[PDB]
Structures are given as C-alpha cells and as structure tokens.
Amino acid sequence: AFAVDAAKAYKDYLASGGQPITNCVKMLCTHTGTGQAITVTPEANMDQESFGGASCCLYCRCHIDHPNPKGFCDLKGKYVQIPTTCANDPVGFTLKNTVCTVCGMWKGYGCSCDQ
Amino acid sequence: SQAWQPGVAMPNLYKMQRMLLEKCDLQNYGDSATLPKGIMMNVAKYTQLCQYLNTLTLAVPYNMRVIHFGAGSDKGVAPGTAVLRQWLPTGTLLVDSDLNDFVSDADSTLIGDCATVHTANKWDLIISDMYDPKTKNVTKENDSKEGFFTYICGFIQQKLALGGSVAIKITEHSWNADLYKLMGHFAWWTAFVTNVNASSSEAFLIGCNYLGKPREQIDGYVMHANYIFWRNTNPIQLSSYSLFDMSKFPLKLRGTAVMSLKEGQINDMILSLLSKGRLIIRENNRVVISSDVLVN
Ligand SMILES: Nc1ncnc2c1ncn2[C@@H]1O[C@H](CSCc2cc(C(=O)O)cc(-c3cccnc3)c2)[C@@H](O)[C@H]1O
Ligand SMILES: [Zn+2]
Numbered sequence: 139a140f141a142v143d144a145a146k147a148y149k150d151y152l153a154s155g156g157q158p159i160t161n162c163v164k165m166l167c168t169h170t171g172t173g174q175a176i177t178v179t180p181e182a183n184m185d186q187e188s189f190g191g192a193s194c195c196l197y198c199r200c201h202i203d204h205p206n207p208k209g210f211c212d213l214k215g216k217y218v219q220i221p222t223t224c225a226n227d228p229v230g231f232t233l234k235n236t237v238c239t240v241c242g243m244w245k246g247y248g249c250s251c252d253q
Numbered sequence: 254s255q256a257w258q259p260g261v262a263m264p265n266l267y268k269m270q271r272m273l274l275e276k277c278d279l280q281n282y283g284d285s286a287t288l289p290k291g292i293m294m295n296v297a298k299y300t301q302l303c304q305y306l307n308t309l310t311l312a313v314p315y316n317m318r319v320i321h322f323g324a325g326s327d328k329g330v331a332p333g334t335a336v337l338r339q340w341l342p343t344g345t346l347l348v349d350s351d352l353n354d355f356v357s358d359a360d361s362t363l364i365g366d367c368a369t370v371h372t373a374n375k376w377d378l379i380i381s382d383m384y385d386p387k388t389k390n391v392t393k394e395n396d397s398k399e400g401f402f403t404y405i406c407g408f409i410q411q412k413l414a415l416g417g418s419v420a421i422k423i424t425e426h427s428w429n430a431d432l433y434k435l436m437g438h439f440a441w442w443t444a445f446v447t448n449v450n451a452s453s454s455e456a457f458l459i460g461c462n463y464l465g466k467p468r469e470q471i472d473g474y475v476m477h478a479n480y481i482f483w484r485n486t487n488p489i490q491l492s493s494y495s496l497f498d499m500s501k502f503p504l505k506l507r508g509t510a511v512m513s514l515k516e517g518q519i520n521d522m523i524l525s526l527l528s529k530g531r532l533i534i535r536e537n538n539r540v541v542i543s544s545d546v547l548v549n
C-alpha cells in the first residue's frame with residue numbers, strides 16, 4: 139500500500155519556502171498564440187510563457203513514475219503555457235492546476251466556460 | 254549589416270583559399286549577447302540555427318526522420334531538442350541521444366556513448382551538438398580529432414538518406430578532417446556561426462542535400478584552416494535580434510517525395526532533384542533504434 143507522493147512533497151516543500159524547480163525550458167515564440175494550456179507547438183498569448191513540456195513535469199524531472207496505470211505523461215513532447223506571473227515555478231503550476239476539457243484553457247487562467 | 258540575420262555563414266571565397274592553420278583569436282572573445290529575459294543560450298542558439306536552416310533547400314518529407322546527438326544538458330533537460338520539436342512539422346519523428354541521462358521532448362531518447370547507437374532506418378536530418386571540452390588544449394598542436402567524429406562520419410555515410418542534410422557542431426579545437434571532406438558529398442555546404450554565440454569559435458558544419466558521392470574534393474585540414482582564417486579576420490557582432498521575430502519560424506512542410514532506389518539507378522536527373530531539395534531516397538519502413546549495452 140506504500141506509494142511515494144512526490145506531488146504532495148513538492149507542494150509541502152514549496153509552502154515551507156523552498157526554491158522552485160529551475161531550468162524549465164522556455165521557448166521563443168510570438169506570444170500571439172491561442173493561450174491554451176498544453177499544445178503541440180508554443181501557443182503563449184501576451185500573458186503567458188511557453189515551455190518545453192517534459193522540463194515542466196514533476197515526474198519527468200524527478201525521475202519517478204507517472205501517477206497513472208498507463209505510466210503516461212501528458213506534458214512530454216508538448217508545450218505548456220504558463221501565466222507570466224507564475225512562470226517562476228512552472229512545475230508547481232502544472233501540478234496545482236487543471237485544464238478545462240472543453241476549451242483547453244487553464245481553469246481560472248483563461249477558461250471562460252463558467253461565466 | 255548581418256546583425257538582423259540569425260547568424261553568418263562562411264563566405265564562398267574563404268572556402269576557396271589554402272590557408273595554414275593558426276590559433277583562433279576572436280576580437281569579440283570577451284563579449285556576450287543580451288538574451289531575451291529568461292531565455293537560455295541553448296534555446297537561442299538552436300533557434301538561430303533553425304532560422305538559418307529555413308533559408309536552405311532542406312528536404313521535408315511526410316513522416317520526416319530527425320536524430321539529435323549531444324542533446325543533454327548538465328541540467329538534465331534537452332533545450333535544443335525542444336527547439337527542434339517546435340521547428341519541425343507536427344508528426345516528425347525526433348530521436349535524441351546523449352552520454353548522460355536527461356529528460357526530453359523527443360519521441361525517443363537513447364542514453365550512452367553515441368557509438369552505442371544503432372538504427373535500422375535512414376534519417377532525413379542529423380543534428381549534433383556533441384563536444385568534448387578536453388579538446389580545448391591550447392598547449393598542443395591542433396590536429397583532427399577522432400572520438401565521436403569517427404562515429405558521425407560513418408553514421409552520415411551509412412544512415413543519411415540521399416537528399417538529407419546535416420548540422421554538426423565544431424569549434425577551433427573540436428573538428429575532424431574527414432567530416433569536412435564529407436561536406437563535399439553534399440550539393441552545398443557551409444560553416445554557420447550563430448549571432449548569439451559569435452564570440453565563440455563554435456560553428457555548425459552544415460551539409461545540405463546529401464548525394465552519397467564526392468561532388469567536390471575537399472582537404473579537411475586546409476578547410477578547417479580556411480574556417481579559422483575567416484573567423485580570425487571577420488569579427489561577428491553579437492546579436493539576439495532575430496530571436497524577437499518568430500512569425501516565420503516553423504519549417505515549411507514541403508511534402509518532399511520519398512523513393513526507394515538502388516545505387517545503379519541514380520540518374521544525373523535524380524542527382525539534380527536531390528541537389529534541389531526535391532527528393533529523399535530511402536526506404537519508408539518503421540523506425541527502429543537501439544543502444545548497445547556492455548555487460549560487465
Ligand atoms: N561521445 C559522445 N557521445 C554522446 N554524447 C556526447 C559525446 N561527447 C559529448 N557528448 C555530449 O554532448 C553534449 C554537448 S557538450 C556540452 C558541454 C559544453 C562545454 C563548453 O562549451 O565549454 C563544456 C562541457 C563540460 C563537460 C564536462 C565537464 N566540464 C564541462 C560540456 C553534452 O551533454 C555531452 O554529454
Ligand atoms: Zn512527465
């Protein structure tokens with residue numbers, strides 16, 4: 139029944155005041171893209187930075203299994219758009235946030251489906 | 254001025270000289286370009302390389318196959334692979350590799366010395382950032398280096414599709430005469446210096462549209478001396494200007510034809526198509542790769 143909980147460990151280390159994971163791979167792009175969360179090519183809008191997905195994934199970066207029966211990563215090989223105000227901790231951001239499954243935006247950072 | 258280009262390619266007249274090798278002494282050796290906020294050198298460098306490759310007649314087939322050697326960083330990520338994946342058409346098969354472990358956006362990653370890498374298929378584009386810092390020995394003769402360059406020359410000759418292209422990092426001290434000689438087996442070649450790293454003697458040796466036969470005879474010792482002479486007498490102004498306009502960055506999906514032909518079937522009509530970036534010659538089977546593991 140024992141399973142390492144890296145997501146909780148990272149969140150707790152963040153709350154404890156620890157420096158976020160660095161060297162996430164920021165891309166050059168136009169910053170006129172769709173603004174959607176996880177895309178096949180950089181899609182940052184004016185308010186976002188685009189990063190290489192694997193470098194923003196806690197499980198890729200820590201060399202630990204992905205928490206899914208299928209050991210699948212939905213960031214690896216894609217680009218993740220991070221609000222510029224959160225871009226100092228892309229890994230923490232992708233851990234703590236959810237993609238709206240109808241519009242593809244981050245809940246609370248672009249998804250207007252609830253208005 | 255060339256400060257708005259992604260970089261500077263070695264002018265043809267310098268290729269035609271017969272210089273003797275001397276020490277590389279760059280006027281701008283000390284300086285650094287000012288990168289956009291939070292952008293790392295390796296992203297900027299690969300972006301400018303890809304912007305320059307956009308000006309060449311690269312073959313871009315459906316189901317393009319690209320392999321990237323030396324793709325790891327000492328941070329355990331692959332920023333050059335991330336730029337390549339941004340640049341290449343969606344659905345391009347991208348494989349990368351490095352001696353040291355790293356996490357990557359490539360479709361598949363092999364860890365180990367590049368000499369352990371084997372592939373069944375041929376490739377449309379080979380990128381190499383491999384570099385051994387122990388070559389930068391200013392206190393001995395600068396001779397042609399072997400190591401990974403030996404592998405790269407064989408890999409080009411065995412596993413690069415006709416019409417395919419190459420970009421292999423060299424420096425003043427990290428270079429190989431046979432690789433320069435192999436440049437004469439493409440329809441065109443150059444040594445390209447990124448504007449962001451112009452204070453370094455690094456360049457990318459680019460072979461454009463592989464022909465599988467010597468089109469030109471190139472003496473590799475002479476050519477590297479020619480390259481250093483060009484660098485020594487042509488200071489390149491450091492510049493990140495081209496990084497701010499990415500509107501035309503993606504590689505144009507040309508849908509270049511892929512055919513399987515046998516050596517005796519290569520017309521000069523075929524050689525012309527190859528030379529123009531209009532044909533890739535390889536089999537189109539499944540892509541299978543592997544890494545040799547030495548057991549104790
Ligand atoms: N035979 C080979 N097979 C497979 N991979 C290979 C092979 N040789 C090299 N590599 C990989 O190429 C990438 C680029 S070299 C980056 C670098 C630059 C500098 C620079 O510029 O001063 C300096 C260093 C460096 C290295 C060690 C200690 N102190 C400084 C490294 C790397 O991740 C290497 O692991
Ligand atoms: Zn992952």
Ligand SMILES: [Zn+2]
Pocket residue numbers: 238239240241242243249250251252
């Ligand atoms: Zn929504």
